[PDB]
Design a protein around this ligand. Structure first.
Ligand SMILES: Cc1cc2nc3c(=O)[nH]c(=O)nc-3n(C[C@H](O)[C@H](O)[C@H](O)COP(=O)(O)OP(=O)(O)OC[C@H]3O[C@@H](n4cnc5c(N)ncnc54)[C@H](O)[C@@H]3O)c2cc1C
Ligand SMILES: Cc1cc2nc3c(=O)[nH]c(=O)nc-3n(C[C@H](O)[C@H](O)[C@H](O)COP(=O)(O)OP(=O)(O)OC[C@H]3O[C@@H](n4cnc5c(N)ncnc54)[C@H](O)[C@@H]3O)c2cc1C
Ligand SMILES: CCC/C=C/C/C=C/CCCCCCCC(=O)O[C@H](COC(=O)CCCCCCCCCCCCCC)COP(=O)(O)OCCN
Ligand SMILES: CCC/C=C/C/C=C/CCCCCCCC(=O)O[C@H](COC(=O)CCCCCCCCCCCCCC)COP(=O)(O)OCCN
Ligand SMILES: CN1CCC[C@@H]1c1ccc(O)nc1
Ligand SMILES: CN1CCC[C@@H]1c1ccc(O)nc1
Ligand SMILES: CN1CCC[C@H]1c1ccc(O)nc1
Ligand SMILES: CN1CCC[C@H]1c1ccc(O)nc1
Lengths: 427, 427
């Protein structure tokens, strides 16, 4: 039997397993898939042989992501500046300026005011308390409604909404304003930081870090899907799909929130958590890598398109590139290449689409979603609780971070808390 | 005898006198100088024959200055756009961008944060209550100290301080932060609005409006300096320098605050007011018109010079212009033409200074100062009170406006209040 079983080998599970191991605990890591890294997933391009791409998480900022920065330094993992944007092709209307910050002077005063309002509202959020524990309900309303209250002129309005669509992976009428503001808060109470934290990337892919961490974890089982976690007895029994059971004093659930509903917990999880876990979060983010010809280097596009954003990803040749688009899978069907062409051409009418590459995270039974974003009304009811222990079962992951949810950094942060919890546990 | 004597024929006195007259009151306006208009003073250029310039107040914005806008509409007074700025020659360091808003991206996050802080602080101010009545003392500290707390990087820091020097007519160590914030508040809680309200000018000079208003005032005495105001009796006695006395039921003091200390009030003014009135406010603003050769049209300069700002005023010929510089008379001696040349050349090394034109408001016994700005510590002690009646003597003027102090608009606003007060008076 083990001191701890860690379920899921994303960055959260990987950190927990590693750190517990180095603390002298006897750990088993169970991973359901054929690979480690989870929603961090570097692989060969489907479109361009020999070219390595990120199909999930990719971007970081040392200043905002200190835990991640520490991991990089720890293993000597090379990073690079994200591609500088030098050509701006927005669709924000005729008054927009083609720069990274496209707001014209005529809108300045409006933006000044909105900046105050947004930051004032964001400053209502204490990152330690949970979004359900702070009388924040008035903010937990559809983003479009909140933004309507800001009364923004057209450039700023559409610029805000575009990036919010990108960042939350939800259309404006499904996103929670409270959550937008959570993201602002996470970035040291900065709206600009939400986009400025797309700062650096893994020179050799996220798998570089994944592999470094896993080398420190002595016992890992791949292709092992946990189906039950039972703490009715003295020792936790973890049952597995086509497998013998495993047993441990403590269990760390480091699988995506939207998958928890597939595990049988005994006894049942605390009742306040149940409804949200059943429903899942509302995240529908969709990251599409687009192989193109005829695009100059360094393009950024933001506007009112079905792709709110479309921007440079990498040089393929002197004529070819990858761009990246963000949209959401409720709004957009990436199997419709005609739709992709239209979406691209809206911004870049000279460019030819050669192919696309993405992973349907929401259809993947090991995930059932991309990165976290709550449905309106969810997280002002229950949030901190989702990430709190139920007896000997801890719950970690980017999904449940109070501090940096939806980022690699949140994965690391949550793991830390669980590790500490366990090391300081009396049982 | 009169219903009302108005003392001073600036815009405040002019409005009060006119409006009381039209209400059927019998009014006398006493003006100490040889002209009406006060710190609004259009005249022929000392440098360029035949060219009319503003030697005091000049700039307005209809949106921020509705009373003034109403006066303009009332008399069909033509206005024009202030000269558009199209060439930026700042001295804000090597990272600055040469545009109206010179802040580089590297400073954006700093400016975001400062915007919140500034507006948060400004929003502490209720414009109706007076600066002494709101527990605002913690803000009434030297501007340099306040700004040090914002921790701004060099471009934004110096840009802020430059415009603040311009606007307050005080160096950073003499200006009150609370007052900066008052100005922000007045402009509907906008920092950007403080400079954006330099929007339009009088096509034919401020004297256009001055003359329009005065045509409606039936009795005016020029060259009549009031030396005493005595309300010990049933009827107010107003004594005059070399003149018979005049008498009225009510008296409106519409002279500059820094001159009140020269009048004998009987009985003495309420004791809380006395110290500030004796000291005067700390305003040292200095507006210099600079006749130049070799300057292209549309220049704006902001930076760390002894002229914080230097900008286009008017075309004189194809080779010649007027620029305008703002500084303060404690820091700068405009009789030192060498100093002027150095100050200009710092920004504009190619330009030749031909001559200058200004009025020494602070040396003018009818004024003893330019526009209002408090010394640190003054207005958190006493402010609203300065503008309140003492028995039958009312106190008006731009200097004492709660709503738009230091602007023509404040002159008009204060007059309104006094007029209303008098019309609704029971006595
Ligand atoms: C398209 C996309 C783009 C992103 N972009 C960025 C970005 O640029 N920067 C950034 O910081 N973050 C980004 N992220 C968010 C970030 O990648 C994720 O939040 C993060 O990697 C999650 O780590 P985790 O350890 O919480 O969960 P995951 O990485 O999801 O790990 C969960 C593990 O659980 C395994 N599992 C599931 N069910 C079972 C079961 N029953 N039994 C056993 N194992 C199971 C899964 O196979 C998986 O390996 C992105 C995410 C997506 C999807
Ligand atoms: C350099 C400068 C630039 C400015 N720029 C602008 C600007 O761009 N926009 C803007 O809105 N405002 C500006 N202003 C501020 C604005 O002009 C003044 O606040 C405003 O005109 C004051 O009007 P007032 O009626 O309060 O006082 P004033 O116009 O000062 O009128 C006071 C009157 O009292 C008379 N007087 C003094 N003592 C006596 C006495 N004992 N007896 C009889 N009469 C006496 C004086 O002669 C004078 O006519 C500027 C001011 C200056 C000095
Ligand atoms: C009493 C002290 C007063 C201090 C005042 C300092 C602020 C003065 C700003 C002066 C002029 C603003 C001009 C606007 C730009 C313009 O017209 O010209 C524009 C540049 O305009 C912009 O960048 C708009 C974005 C600005 C948003 C700013 C939000 C809050 C900033 C608050 C400022 C804080 C300052 C430092 C702490 C050029 O192309 P465009 O016109 O097609 O786009
Ligand atoms: C979850 C929703 C998130 C929504 C995010 C929207 C904000 C994203 C901003 C994205 C990128 C910022 C780049 C900075 C500019 C740059 O690098 O390039 C610069 C332009 O930079 C600037 O203009 C700096 C002034 C900005 C001050 C803004 C203050 C507050 C604004 C808050 C924004 C509110 C947005 C709409 C309501 C070009 O020359 P330079 O680099 O030599 O100068
Ligand atoms: C450098 N970051 C800051 C904001 C956006 C920018 C960026 C992001 C992604 C990318 O590929 N290139 C540049
Ligand atoms: C149009 N205003 C807005 C801010 C500064 C600008 C301005 C001010 C004075 C002037 O002469 N020309 C332009
Ligand atoms: C940085 N975030 C964390 C979750 C999604 C991701 C992201 C990455 C690039 C981009 O343009 N928008 C969002
Ligand atoms: C608009 N304000 C009212 C008082 C001084 C004046 C002003 C006018 C032009 C400028 O650049 N700075 C300040």
């Amino acid at each position: 039997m083990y001191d701890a079983i860690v379920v899921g080998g994303g960055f959260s599970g990987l950190k927990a397993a590693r750190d517990l191991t180095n603390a002298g605990k006897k750990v088993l890591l169970l991973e359901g898939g054929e690979r480690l890294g989870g929603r961090a997933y570097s692989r060969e391009s489907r479109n361009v042989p020999g070219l390595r791409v990120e199909i999930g998480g990719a971007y970081l900022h040392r200043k905002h992501h200190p835990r991640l920065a520490a991991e990089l330094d720890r293993y000597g993992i090379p990073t690079a500046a994200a591609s500088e944007f030098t050509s701006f092709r927005h669709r924000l209307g005729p008054t927009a300026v083609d720069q990274a910050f496209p707001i014209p002077g005529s809108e300045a005063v409006a933006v000044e005011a909105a900046t105050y309002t947004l930051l004032r509202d964001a400053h209502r959020i204490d990152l330690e308390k949970g979004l359900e524990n702070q009388d924040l309900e008035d903010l937990d309303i559809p983003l479009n409604e909140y933004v309507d209250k800001l009364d923004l002129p057209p450039v700023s309005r559409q610029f805000l909404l575009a990036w919010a669509w990108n960042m939350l992976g939800q259309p404006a009428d499904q996103a929670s304003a409270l959550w937008m503001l959570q993201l602002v808060a996470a970035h040291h109470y900065s709206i600009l930081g939400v986009v400025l934290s797309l700062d650096e990337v893994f020179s050799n892919g996220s798998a570089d870090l994944v592999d470094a961490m896993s080398q420190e974890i002595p016992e890992i089982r791949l292709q092992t899907v946990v189906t039950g976690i039972d703490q009715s007895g003295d020792v936790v029994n973890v049952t597995v799909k086509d497998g013998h059971a495993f047993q441990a004093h403590s269990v760390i659930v480091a699988t995506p929130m939207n998958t928890w509903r597939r595990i049988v917990f005994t006894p049942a999880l605390p009742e306040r958590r149940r409804s949200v876990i059943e429903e899942g979060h509302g995240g529908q983010g969709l990251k599409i890598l687009i192989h193109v010809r005829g695009a100059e280097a360094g393009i950024e596009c933001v506007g009112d398109g079905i792709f709110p954003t479309l921007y440079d990803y990498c040089e393929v040749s002197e004529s070819e590139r990858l761009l990246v688009a963000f949209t959401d899978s409720g709004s957009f069907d990436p199997t419709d290449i005609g739709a992709v062409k239209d979406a691209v051409l809206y911004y870049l009418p000279e460019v030819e689409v050669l192919g696309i590459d993405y992973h349907d995270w929401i259809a993947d039974p090991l995930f059932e979603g991309p990165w976290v974003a709550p449905r309106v009304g969810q997280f002002s009811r229950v949030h901190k609780e989702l990430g709190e222990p139920a007896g000997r079962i801890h719950f970690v992951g980017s999904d449940v971070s109070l501090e940096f949810p939806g980022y690699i950094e949140g994965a690391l942060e949550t793991a830390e808390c669980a590790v500490n919890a366990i090391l300081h546990s009396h049982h």
